[PDB]
C-alpha cells in the first residue's frame, strides 16, 4: 500500500505507507490516504521522500552508510519542513 503526499505547488509524491509512517506527524495526518502540505514546495518534499527511502535502507546496516546529501539552496527550507515533521 502507498500514500500520496502533495506539495504546495501541486506535485503528487506517491511513496510506500511504511516509509511515510516514519514521520509521526504524517501518521497523525493520515489517521486518510492523501496528505496536502500547503507550505512545503516540491523541491523540499522530493528530498523528504528520498530521506524516507534512505532511512529505511540504511537503518540497521553493518555496511558503510553514505552521507545524505543536501544542496545548500534547499537546506533552509528542508530544515523547516524537517522541524515541522519531526524527522
Amino acid at each position: 500500500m502507498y500514500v500520496k503526499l502533495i506539495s504546495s505547488d501541486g506535485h503528487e509524491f506517491i511513496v510506500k505507507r511504511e516509509h511515510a509512517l516514519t514521520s509521526g506527524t504524517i501518521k497523525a495526518m493520515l489517521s486518510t490516504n492523501e496528505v496536502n502540505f500547503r507550505e512545503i514546495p516540491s523541491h523540499v518534499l522530493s528530498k523528504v521522500c528520498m530521506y524516507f527511502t534512505y532511512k529505511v535502507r540504511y537503518t540497521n546496516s553493518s555496511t558503510e552508510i553514505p552521507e545524505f546529501p543536501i544542496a545548500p539552496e534547499i537546506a533552509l527550507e528542508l530544515l523547516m519542513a524537517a522541524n515541522f515533521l519531526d524527522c
Partner: protein, 103 residues
C-alpha cells in the same frame, strides 16, 4: 540488487525500488498497481529513450551505482489514450530561492 527509482509523469512521482534483474514490463505492473493503468497503455523511458518490455532494469542503465536510495534514478512514464500515446511529459519541481547572502 535493489535499484531505487522515481517513476515520473506530469506532476506525479512514484518512489519505489526494484531488482536490477526485474523487467521493464514488471515495473509496468508495479505502476499498474498504483495508478490503475494497464501496461499496454504505458511507456517507460530512460531520459528520452523508450525502454523495451523484456529488458532488465540493469540493461536499461538502472544499477546500484546510478539508482541509490538517497539519489534515485528517474523513469519517465507516458500513458496511452484512445490508442495514441501522449508524448513524454515530466513537469519540473519548484525552484529554490536565491541563496541567502549569509550563506
Amino acid at each position: 540488487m535493489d535499484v531505487f527509482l522515481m517513476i515520473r509523469r506530469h506532476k506525479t512521482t512514484i518512489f519505489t525500488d526494484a531488482k536490477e534483474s526485474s523487467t521493464v514490463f514488471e515495473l509496468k505492473r508495479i505502476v499498474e498497481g498504483i495508478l490503475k493503468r494497464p501496461p499496454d497503455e504505458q511507456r517507460l523511458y530512460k531520459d528520452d529513450q523508450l525502454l523495451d518490455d523484456g529488458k532488465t532494469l540493469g540493461e536499461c542503465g538502472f544499477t546500484s551505482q546510478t539508482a541509490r536510495p538517497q539519489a534515485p534514478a528517474t523513469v519517465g512514464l507516458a500513458f496511452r489514450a484512445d490508442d495514441t500515446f501522449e508524448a513524454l511529459c515530466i513537469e519540473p519541481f519548484s525552484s529554490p530561492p536565491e541563496l541567502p547572502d549569509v550563506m
